[PDB]
Amino acid sequence: MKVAVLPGDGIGPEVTEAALKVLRALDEAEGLGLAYEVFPFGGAAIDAFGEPFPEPTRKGVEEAEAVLLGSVGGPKWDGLPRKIRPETGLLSLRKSQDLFANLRPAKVFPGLERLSPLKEEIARGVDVLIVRELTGGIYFGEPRGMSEAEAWNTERYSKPEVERVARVAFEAARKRRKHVVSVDKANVLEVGEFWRKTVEEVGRGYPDVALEHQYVDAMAMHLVRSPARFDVVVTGNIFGDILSDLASVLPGSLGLLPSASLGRGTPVFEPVHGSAPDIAGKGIANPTAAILSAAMMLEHAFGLVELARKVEDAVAKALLETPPPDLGGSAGTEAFTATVLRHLA
Amino acid sequence: MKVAVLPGDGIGPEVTEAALKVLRALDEAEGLGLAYEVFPFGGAAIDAFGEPFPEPTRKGVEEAEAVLLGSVGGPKWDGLPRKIRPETGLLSLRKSQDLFANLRPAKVFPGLERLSPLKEEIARGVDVLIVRELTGGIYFGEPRGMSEAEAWNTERYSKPEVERVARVAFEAARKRRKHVVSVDKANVLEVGEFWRKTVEEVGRGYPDVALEHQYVDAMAMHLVRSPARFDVVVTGNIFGDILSDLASVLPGSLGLLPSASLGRGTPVFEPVHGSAPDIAGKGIANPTAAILSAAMMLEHAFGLVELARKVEDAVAKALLETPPPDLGGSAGTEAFTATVLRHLA
Ligand SMILES: CS/C=C(\O)C(=O)O
Ligand SMILES: CS/C=C(\O)C(=O)O
Ligand SMILES: [Mg+2]
Ligand SMILES: [Mg+2]
Question: Which residues bind substrate (chains A, B)?
Fold first, then answer.
C-alpha cells in the first residue's frame, strides 16, 4: 500500500491529515502495507519550487500505487500564468495518468435525510455512484471552432473509450449492489446509439451485474424523484459532468463528498471540495469527504471493499454522534476524526 | 382571437374541453374575438382520414392565430408506419410552423409545496420558465454518423438561431419578473462561448430585463437547491431538453404542466402530458395543464398578460379548494373546471 499523499492548500492538509489518521489506525489494527510519503502539490509546491506539479511529486505519483489528494488553489496564486496556476497542477496530474473514469458517490447516510434538498422519504436510502468518462466526447472533439456567423463542436466517442469507462462502472457495481444504469441520448444522437450498443456488449462480460439504459433527460428527473433506486450510473463526459453535479447536491452538504479518478496510471482520490481559504487553519473543516476518499482508495485502488465499508460505517456513525458544523453541529476536524476512530476500533 | 383547436386523443378532448369552457367564460365576460374551430388531429384524424395531420387541419392551423392542442397517440395506432403515427403528426405540425422556442413553466402554487419532491422551504415560490431552442444544435448538426470503431455528432448553432430564441426568452421575462438566465457550457465549448456572447448582445435590447449566465451543470444543481430564485431560463436544444425535464418534476404532478411552442408560424399551446389511454373517458384527468396552456396562449400568442394571470390565479385557488385526484383529492375534470370558473367570475 504505497500512497503518494498530496495535501496541497487551504483545508487540504487538515482533512488529508484526518484521512491518514484513519488509514494509520487501519494499518495498525489490520496490518496493511501502508507506506506513504507527503509531496508538495499546488500552491504549497509553487511556494517552494516555482511550479505546482514538481518532478519529485511527479516521481512520487508514478511510483505510488495510489494518490490521496487534498485540494489546491487560493487567492495568493489566482493572478498567475495559466501554465503555472495550482488548477493546471490538477490538470497535469490527471492527464499525466490518463484517468478516464471519474467516480462520484452521492450518499444520504441514515439519519441525515434532514440535510437533503429532497424530502425525507425520497432522500432515504440514496446511495448512487456516478461514473463519468473523462477523456473523450464533445469537450475534446475535433473539428471545433467559432466563426463570426456560427460555431461548432463535435461530440466523438470511439469504441475503446466507451469500453474502458463501461468496464470501470461494472467492476464498481460488482463491489456494490450489482446494478448499472447507462445514460445516453440514443433515441436522437448516433453517438448515443453507439454508446448504448457498446455498453450493452460490455455488460455481457458481467453476468452478475444487471444493466439498464436511460436517456439523460429521463435520468435528470429520476435523480430528483427517486434517486434511491439507483446503484451505479455510467455515462459520457458532458452528461457525467451534469449528472454527477446533479447527484451531488443530494446528500445536501459539500463536506460529505468524495471522488476517485481511475485509468491507466496511478488512481487519484480526492474530496470534491476545494481548499476553502475562508476556513483554512480554523480546525473546522468537515473531514468526511477526505476520509471517504481514503475509503474509496481502499476500495477501487486496493480491492479492499470490506475495509472501505468499515470506514464508511464509522463515518456514518460519527456524522450522527458528533456532526460537524456544516451538518449543523459542533465537531471540529480533530474531534470528528476522533469519533470516526472510536467507531473503527 | 382565431384559434384552431386540436383535441386529439385519449384525455385530449376532455381537458381541451375544460380549457375552452375557461376561454369561453373569458370571452363572454371580457369580450375577446374568441372564434375557434375543432379540427381532428392525431388518432382521431387517422380514424377518419388515413393520416394524422390532414389538410383541413393543416389549413386551420395556418389560418388560425394560435393552436390549442390536446394530446395524441395510443395503443390503437402504435403498430403503424412511422410516417403515419400520431407522434409524427406532432412532428409535422411543429415543423410546419418552424417553432424554434419551447416554453415550459414549472410552478409550485402556494399551498402545493407538499407535492414537490423538494422540501417545503425550497419548493415555496418556485416559478421558473424554461425556454428551449427547438430547431438547432447537436440534435440536428451535420456531419453525423456511426462507423464500426466510432461515432460522431456535431453541435452547431448559428448567430440568427441563438438570436431568435434569446429574443423569445426576453419578451417572456418582460411579461414576468424581468430576470433571465442563459445556460451554456462556455468555459469548455466554443459553441458555448458563442451562445454566451450572442445572448449578451441581445440582452442589450432589453434594458428592463437583467441577464445572467450559468453553466448547465451549475444550473442542474441550482434547479434542485434553489429553484425559487429563477424567473426565465434560456438555453440550447439538448440542454433545454434536460433542464426543462429537470424543472418539470419540481411542482410534483404531471397534470399541472403547460407548454407553448413559438416561432414563425402559428404558436401551439399544449399540455406536456400525453393522451393517457388508461384514464381516457373516466372524467378524472386533471385539466390544469390544458387550462394553463390556454393561459399561456392568452399570454404569448395574444399579449393578454393580465387575463393569463387571472386564469393562473383561479387555477391556483381551485387546486387548493377542490384538488384533483392526482393532487391527492377528488375533483374530476368537470368539477375542478367548475371551481376554476367560480374563481374567474
Ligand atoms: C475533471 S475531474 C473533477 C473532480 O474530480 C473534482 O472536482 O473533484
Ligand atoms: C419537442 S417539443 C415537446 C413538447 O412540447 C412536449 O412534450 O409537450
Ligand atoms: Mg451485465
Ligand atoms: Mg438585458
Answer: 94, 104, 132, 217
Rounded to whole angstroms, how far apart are CA atoms B340 and B126?
Answer: 21
Closest to A119 (Cβ–Cβ): which among B119, B218, B224? B119
CA-CA distance, A331 to A325, in Å (whole number)? Answer: 6
Q: Which three cell numbers stand for residue B154?
A: 456535431
Helix (H, G, I), strand (E, B) or coil at B229: helix
Pairing of strands B179-184, B232-235: parallel
Min Cα distance B255 → chain A (Å) is 16
CA distance A35 to chain B (A): 38
Is there a contact between A145 and B249 if contact means CB atoms under 8 Å apart? Answer: no
Please count the structural domains in chain A.
Answer: 1
A134 CA to middle of ligand 1, Å? Answer: 9
Count the Cβ atoms, other than its own, within 10 Å of residue A114. 12
CA A55, CA B240: separation in Å to the nearest integer? 44
Determine if ligand 2 sits within 6 Å of the CB of residue B102. yes
Residue B125: partners with Cβ closer than 8 Å, 6 or more residues away: B108, B228
Strand stretches in chain B, DSSP E: 2-8, 35-38, 66-71, 99-107, 127-133, 145-146, 150-158, 179-184, 210-215, 232-235, 258-263, 268-271
CA B213 – ligand 4 centroid, Å? 12
| CA A270–ligand 1 middle distance (angstroms) | 8
The experimental technique used to determine this model is: X-ray
Looking at this protein, which amino acid is placed at residue B294? A
Domain that holds residue B114: 1-345
- Rounded to a whole number of angstroms, the CA Rg of chain A reads 20
3-state SS assignment for residue B322 = coil
Final resolution, Å: 2.8
Q: Answer yes or no: is the C-beta of A270 below 6 A from any ligand 1 atom.
A: yes
Element housing B58 (H / E): helix B55-63
* Candidates B238, B243, B253, B272, partner chain A, best to mutate (most A CBs within 10 A): B238
Three cell numbers written together for B199: 445572448
- Amino acid occupying residue A107: K
Hunting for cell 465537531 — which residue is that?
A331
| Ramachandran angles phi, psi of A330, nearest 5° | -125, -10
Looking at A139, A175, A178, A313, which residue is catalytic?
A139
Return phi, psi of residue B329, to 5°.
-115, -155
Q: Go through B168-186 and write b for each residue having 16 or more CB atoms within 10 A of its CB, e for each that does not.
A: bbbbbbebbeeebbbbbbb
From chain B, the residues in CB contact with A139 under 8 A are 188-189
- Record: contact B119-A118, CB cut-off 8 A: yes
- A178 has binding-site annotation: no
Interface membership of A159 toward B (CB under 8 Å): yes
Ligand 1 atom closest to residue A134's alpha carbon, by position in its atom list = 1
* DSSP result, A119-131: -HHHHTT-EEEEE
Q: Which CATH number covers residue A36?
A: 3.40.718.10
Please state, in angstroms and as integers, the Cα–Cα distance from residue B261 to each residue in A171, A218, B270, following that order: 44, 21, 8
Within A175-262, where are the H helices?
190-203, 216-225, 237-248
The protein residue with its alpha carbon nearest to ligand 1, atom 6, reads A272
B35 touches chain A (CB under 8 A): no
- A299 neighbors A129 (Cβ within 8 angstroms): no
Which atom of ligand 2 is the closest one to the Cα of B104? 5
Dihedral sign from CA coordinates of A91, A92, A94, A100: positive
* Distance from the first to the final alpha carbon of chain B: 21
Measured distance CA(B344)–CA(B312) in Å, rounded: 10
| Cα–Cα distance, B224 to B213 (Å, whole number) | 17
The residue of chain B with its CA nearest to that of A118 is: B118
